Amino acid sequence: NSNNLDSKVGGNYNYLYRLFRKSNLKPFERDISTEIYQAGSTPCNGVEG
């Protein structure tokens, strides 16, 4: 537990997690790309919405 180490009044905005990815991962593999996921079939070309 790290309640008194990281937890900051207001919350920690520096800790991120990947909720969306195009395909499943491989063991010991890291992904840092911030490309906008094409959730819909409509291509966004890097435009959020």
Binding site: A39, G40, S41, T42
Partner: protein, 49 residues
Amino acid sequence: EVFNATRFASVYAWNRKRISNCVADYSVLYNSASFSTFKCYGVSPTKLN
């Protein structure tokens, strides 16, 4: 037949319609862009199909 309809019941007396014995295509509904709010709980919108 139920959602093109022009009548929507009141919230406190809402209309419930059962759906069974057919094939459901959710992906085509999700791809179409005429709705302004979509969210799911317990399942992701891309997998219903």
